[PDB]
DNA sequence: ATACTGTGGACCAGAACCCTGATAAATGCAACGCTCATAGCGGGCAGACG
């Protein structure tokens, strides 16, 4: 409900001159950079080492909600949203009259005149109804919810009294129905509006061809730049009737309503649109930018995207007895283990600190992402070894398997942590030691040798000068150190 | 359905569902298949059957019968998994959990039965007092349906009688104890029932689970086999101790009745086929006539050890 | 719809020794402890006898609801259908293969359409049948819904997959038609089960006679303990040839299905009884048992004496107002807590807050007139004027 | 009987609170099929899943309406109210009631 | 897509007061025609700088907007609108009240005044053509582009009818009657607003029932023109056998005029003619035989070729590019290409591409033949056929087509995308090499800036090499305090 | 039915104050099809669009509403105006109505 | 010690199949039609007086 003033911008280009709809979006100068400046991540220090353990339990926990890396995919999707965005408009221009008007001057022009030859071949919906199948697991919806939440959902024009709705989000459920699509579209109109459209609009006497011709009407009337289905892999075909008029109703979702339309499935839903996907007929449309997991090799060499996510993953680690360099041999290891799926590959990583902090030694090994690949990946066997084998159709049964109530485990597996008895050398050496700020210079040279003679000579130096910054008191730690 | 009943000991998975719509007044023959499976496409098999998982669906909330153990010790599948292949027998059950019926006897490819040979329901004379004084009940059981033995291991012939699988191929049929069981004469050839004795204990054996020799571990074995007790010359089949072993062992109608003719006189026969480098799948009858002729004090699943090891 | 996993006793009767189905149920308990066990009251508590009026007029018409006591009779009818469906489970033990000739015979009368079919002379059915009779508005329903209450509904076992049904209760539709009662049976076993059997096996257009022996059957398909029918008298009023034809079928099924059958009804559904089993009769309660007062009620007054929630009351009781109770109510379980709620409405709206015996019969002859010409039957007391009307004492 | 076993479901899918009855006047006689019939219906209607009923009618229903004690327990589960016109003479005083009717 | 009617006189004496004709845009000579549909990108002067991926989909977008028109092309112009203003004559709405006329005709000729009189004139058969030529020759793009000046629905008011002019149907790969038959349909509720699938189109009829209610449906509404594309899938499918095939497009006599066009590669021509009955109603109005360009004419190149080419070349989007063309690359493109008009776009989208990747940034022959050896691969006997010239080398290999074009632009474009960038700070990471730099540095980070931190890390090895890490620490702290 | 959703799609989006529909009459009972059904239809007409409708209609269409009018439930609508010719005979006496329009 | 002959392994090619689409015929099943029992009704017959 940001309803922010239209003000219009200018924007250089022939066609998008002068259109009360388009100005109001952002500019799309430096977007590039914008586009590219979805990166965030936790801050992380070296204080929030020495806390208790569930404090450091607590901040794992809170990983794979606040990380997200862009990648090459990213880029080519963002722009391509772009275009379906801002060239939506070119048609409903408000000033200016419609297209109808427009045609039909043109056949009057045409006819006598001197106007010799007039195009009538108009706008294809008015962009391509993007199909984004892909693998489940790899990342799409957060993708679309973030890439999509930049631009302001609702822009309240000033002399003209209507509501530029931006985007929408329909969103299917375990076995859904035809009709529930239609319903839940005017349901989710409300949220965005405030209105009360499934009052007048929403009751289930109508039919079906009904539901669709109130939506023509309604979409009409609001400016709509965007209708994303989601969760085509979660429907039902029997229940809802015959599988082959899916693809029916869908094409007529597409041809009625006229906004650009953007569903996103699964292999598994390909088989619906696979009859219009082959042929390269104009009019069926659905273009699809196909979802591949990470490779790990390109010409022979290892791929620059694996180890750029790799590095930049491992650097979130918080281990007590953590080496800096990662070793070749697990970076060989986990990619055999997880395929390259990118939610079970930060999944592993995040079970595998719980599973060390508590089982002994705080480090991480080949063994330890074995354990827990034989732990917590029981529903994903299968499609990960049909992933291994390559052939479509072993990919395409193992479909839409997703591992359930993670978080659930997550609880217990803090709880578990928080009932422990026994302690580690180092937490009884930071325990002992007047760890404010003095424990840095501990923690950076551990180490080199034992601390047994360390404990009381950085006691020694800072009781000879209470008054001292680090960077003085690193060079004579060190002195005394070395004699 | 909320009430499935539980197999019994060592019987097939269609007398299972049989009795699934025998229990609850189940007279049309498709509302069993609408209710059991919910299409009324699924064919009816005896041996090798699919769709399997949806008949586990219904067992699901005990927790012991699973996808594996209904297929190891429910059907006649172990019959083919160790001795054509250890791929083909990882993947046979992928390939049979799920709705593909065509494949399942094309991609094991022996059951190119064509004409349904000796698919007529069969039973025991002796074996249904048994089932009947220990339960009440009476079943098809796995030791009847034997692929090629028409005999039951322990004694006697099975009672054929004129119906076919091909008569109603949408149809499961339980035995009836109204249905009158008629004794006759029983003509028996002791060689064909100490075959059957031979090859039953193979049918529930745990260390079938995984056992399967290689092609050419095949060929390395019955090479040195061969080789061991002077069965080869050098570098030729001798032809004849081969011969007269199995001659020795078994008489000729008992051939006739396996339909496994020698030929000694045409080049092609199947003894010699065996012997030569393997490349397609071979049925337990080979084996066994041949593990049985070259050496007879040596059980199944110690000579699958043996033929394995080395 | 209680689902609830099974663990067995060890019951002491040598009968009982093997069977899972008789031996998962919760133990018979002695007359003693039985007794304690089915009355319940209210919570009462004196916090809410200063506050408001209306707070108040709720929990005073929240008595009839939630307050129930053991008369003598109910401690014999809940002995009696303790041994009734415990006795309905020797002939069907599953163990020893007694189910599977029970089950196996069933499918040979769904063939052939008649119900002396009988495949296994071995099978053996062992079951029982009662009618309770009684004066309307005695609480009969209610008897039969806290004394079969122990008994959990629906219990599921893991050796076997069945899922015992202990207890099934269904009415007569009011026409008394052949089909609806066999259409109501396949509606109460849908319910208490969560299941779909009325489609597959109504929907489909069959004759009476195999609709009969599909009942015989799905009921063994499960482990039925009781079917219990209640408003047995709309079988009088169906078509010729009817009137018998149930009550041979609910015979039949007794006899050679082996499940038991307890019928209730008003006392005018007697006549086509013994238009032509246990019988028990079922009065209203009366004070003058022989040469002295009853004691049971005086404990019952007293027991609903103490739940008054007014202000100002009489702590002790008067004999007075246990006369005005007996020679306006009759003593038929209805009337009379229906009776004293109004009047203490009554009492709680006017002002007057305590319960006089005036106040009862004002309220008496003003706000129960429907009621009151069969009642000058009772009070009355002449037995030919008594006997016309119906559902009275005969 | 199918409607109304039927009609349980969809009283129990709605959470429905009270069902109210009115012009029961016309069921005296007709083509019901027999009163003491259509009064098993009325009684019959309590398989209906809780839901009180109200009924309204006018003074020549109950005579004829309620005449078996079954069905006149039922009828008055909770008291029967009946109504009557405004008397102009209480006790030979005049009603406030009524005057403040008319002047109002 | 209901544009209103409004009516212009023509020349030609035989269309004098029909609607249907006169509804429709005016004659125009052949040249203009052909000259009128010729179309390029925009290509704005300053857009050489920008983002990789921005040109990239500008370069993506180049097959679908370059068309260049040619000879043949005005000829196929001519016969369409021949065929589609030449079987409108047969049915004319506008009729004046007959009933009169034909009445006092037949009393004349009764009453023996007159000797003869033509009562009812019934129509006879319908026009045809079949367009055949190489997969690839632009059969299609030159046919959505053809056919796109003429309105598809019109309205008259006056009247109520709706005038489908054209209408377009291709067969699947299954090859089956009944899929074009219902496909039809699909296409003609899909032009229209309306149900017909399922109103005519049920399980219930046979395929002479649904053949027998096009004639219905096709006379309701006024058509134009029925062209089917793709009829190579109908040679030897499951559809009957040939006998069938011959015999359902000697039937489709049957519907009302709508002069039909059929459209089909080399191969199909002998399946589909082999009886003399049907090659007459093939080549009915003509047969147009379509042949890829070649780079000579008779001893001196082919100007076509020559204009084709260097219109295509200024299109291109590089930062430093040769306006003017070596003749080389030109000769490269005759030979790799050698005529076909789909694979000599695509070599260049292709190029072009592969260039931005490895930033040679400049279209060469060795880039060519780079390409071509390593994309193109399937296409090799076409062309291999098409270098020797014999006839039935040629026809042999006819029908060939790149698959997954598609998907691997797509792979291109995330190739280019990944490129990245590299800030000097963080290249500075890259310059510590030895495992025990980038140690020394992950445990420095914290006190230090990486500006100063890096160099006096780096000429602490340059002098001192064989001395180890603890050791290390105590001389870079010396430099890094002074 | 589209057309009766998007006709009060329609009169919500303007500002519309009387719908007034002219001449019942003429409307064929053949392929219309059930009087019932045609009552269905104007109640239903009357209830989506949401704003106040008047009916004019032949004696002839009292026929069809028959159903309809005969109820007095609240809610039902439909109040009936009768139209006559002028009468002359009211109380004994000729009207003035009639004289003074014959003269006029 | 090399030409002659068996021979095992690798290899052409016709053939049973068998899968699928196009078309006619048997058929189960909601869709009215029918039957049965039940309650009020207007022309006809006995009646009856001036
Ligand atoms: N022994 C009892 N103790 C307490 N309350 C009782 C007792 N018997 C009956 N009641 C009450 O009386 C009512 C029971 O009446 P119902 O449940 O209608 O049974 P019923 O109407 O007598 O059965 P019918 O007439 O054969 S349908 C409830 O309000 C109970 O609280
Ligand atoms: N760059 C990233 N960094 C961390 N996690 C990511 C990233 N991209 C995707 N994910 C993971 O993808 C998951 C959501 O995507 P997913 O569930 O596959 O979509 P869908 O629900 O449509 O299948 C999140 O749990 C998130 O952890
Ligand atoms: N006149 C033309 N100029 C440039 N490119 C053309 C022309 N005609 C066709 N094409 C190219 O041909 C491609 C389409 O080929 P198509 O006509 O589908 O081949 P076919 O006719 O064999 O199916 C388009 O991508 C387009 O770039
Ligand atoms: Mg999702
Ligand atoms: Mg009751
Ligand atoms: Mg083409
Ligand atoms: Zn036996």
């Known amino acids: 409900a940001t309803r922010i003033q239209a003000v219009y911008r200018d924007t250089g280009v022939e066609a998008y001159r002068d259109n009360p709809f388009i100005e109001a979006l952002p500019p799309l100068q430096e977007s590039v950079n914008s586009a590219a400046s979805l990166k965030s991540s936790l801050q992380l220090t070296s204080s929030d080492l020495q806390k208790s353990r569930v404090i450091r339990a607590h901040t794992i926990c809170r990983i794979p909600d606040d990380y997200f890396q862009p990648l090459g995919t990213h880029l080519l999707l963002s722009e391509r949203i772009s275009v379906m965005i801002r060239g939506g408009y070119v048609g409903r221009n408000p000033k200016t009259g419609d297209l109808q008007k427009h045609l039909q001057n043109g056949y009057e022009r045409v006819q006598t005149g001197e106007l010799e030859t007039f195009r009538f071949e108009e706008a294809r919906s008015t962009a391509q109804s993007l199909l984004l199948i892909g693998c489940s697991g790899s990342g799409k919806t957060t993708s679309l919810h973030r890439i999509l939440a930049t631009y302001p959902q609702v822009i309240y024009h000033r002399e003209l009294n209507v509501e530029q709705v931006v985007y929408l989000k329909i969103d299917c459920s375990h076995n859904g129905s035809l009709k529930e699509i239609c319903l839940n579209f005017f349901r989710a109109l409300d949220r965005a509006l405030g209105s009360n459209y499934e009052r007048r609009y929403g009751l289930k006497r109508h039919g079906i061809e009904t539901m669709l011709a109130l939506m023509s009407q309604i979409a009409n009337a609001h400016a709509l730049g ?13 229940r809802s009737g015959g599988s082959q008029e899916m693809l029916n109703f869908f094409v007529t979702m597409v041809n009625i309503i006229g906004v650009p339309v953007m569903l996103i499935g699964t292999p598994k839903a390909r088989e619906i649109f696979e009859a219009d996907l082959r042929s390269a007929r104009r009019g069926a449309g659905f273009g699809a930018i196909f979802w591949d997991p990470i490779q790990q090799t390109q010409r022979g060499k290892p791929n620059q995207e694996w180890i750029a996510f790799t590095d930049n993953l491992w650097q979130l680690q918080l281990l007590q007895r953590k080496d800096a360099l990662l070793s070749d041999e697990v970076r060989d290891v986990w990619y055999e283990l997880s395929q390259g799926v990118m939610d079970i590959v930060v999944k592993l990583f995040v079970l595998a600190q719980l599973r060390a902090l508590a089982l002994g030694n705080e480090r991480i090994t080949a063994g330890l992402l074995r354990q827990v690949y034989q732990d917590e990946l029981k529903p994903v066997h299968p499609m990960l070894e049909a992933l291994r084998s390559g052939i479509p159709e072993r990919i395409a ?15 217990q597996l ?7 008895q026994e302690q580690t050398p180092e937490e009884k050496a930071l325990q002992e030691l007047d760890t404010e700020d003095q424990r840095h210079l501990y923690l950076m040279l551990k180490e080199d040798y034992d601390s047994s003679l360390l404990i009381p000579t950085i006691k020694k130096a800072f009781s000879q000068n209470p008054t001292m910054t680090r960077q003085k008191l690193l060079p004579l730690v060190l002195q005394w150190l070395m004699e | 359905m909320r009430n499935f009943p539980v197999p019994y000991s060592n019987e097939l998975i269609y007398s299972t569902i049989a009795r699934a719509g025998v229990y609850q007044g189940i007279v049309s023959p498709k509302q069993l298949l609408d209710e059991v499976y919910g299409n009324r496409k699924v064919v009816a098999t005896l041996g090798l059957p699919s769709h399997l998982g949806v008949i586990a669906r219904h067992l699901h909330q005990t927790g012991r019968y699973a996808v594996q153990q209904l297929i190891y010790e429910h059907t006649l599948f172990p019959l083919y998994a160790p001795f054509v292949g250890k791929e083909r027998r990882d993947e046979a059950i992928r390939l049979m959990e799920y709705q593909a019926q065509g494949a399942v006897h094309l991609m094991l490819g022996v059951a190119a039965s064509r004409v349904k040979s000796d698919n007529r329901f069969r039973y025991c004379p002796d074996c249904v007092a048994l089932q009947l004084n220990r339960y009440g009940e009476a079943f098809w059981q796995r030791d009847w349906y034997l692929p090629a033995l028409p005999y039951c291991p322990k004694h006697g012939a099975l009672v054929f009688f004129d119906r076919a699988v091909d008569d109603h191929r949408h149809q499961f049929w339980a035995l009836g104890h109204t249905e009158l069981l008629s004794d006759y004469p029983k003509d028996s050839l002791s060689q064909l029932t100490a075959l059957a004795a031979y090859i039953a204990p193979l049918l529930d054996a745990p260390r079938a689970q995984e056992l399967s020799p290689s092609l050419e571990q095949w060929t390395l074995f019955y090479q040195r086999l061969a080789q061991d007790l002077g069965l080869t010359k050098s570098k030729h089949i001798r032809h004849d101790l081969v011969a007269e072993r199995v001659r020795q062992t078994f008489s000729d109608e008992a051939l006739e009745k396996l339909d496994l003719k020698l030929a000694e006189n045409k080049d092609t ?3 010699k086929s065996i012997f030569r480098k393997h490349r ?9 006539i041949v593990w049985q002729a070259l050496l007879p004090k040596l059980t199944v699943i110690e000579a699958l050890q043996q033929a394995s090891a080395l």
């Open chain 1, 397 to 411: 049964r193992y479909s839409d398997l997703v591992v359930p109530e993670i978080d659930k485990r997550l609880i």
């Open chain 1, 226 to 238: 965007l209708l994303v289905i989601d969760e085509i892999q979660h429907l039902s075909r029997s």
């Open chain 2, 269 to 271: 026969c199947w003894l």
């Open chain 1, 414 to 420: 803090q709880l578990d942590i928080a009932a422990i």
């Open chain 2, 280 to 288: 397609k799948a071979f049925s337990y009858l080979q084996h066994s």
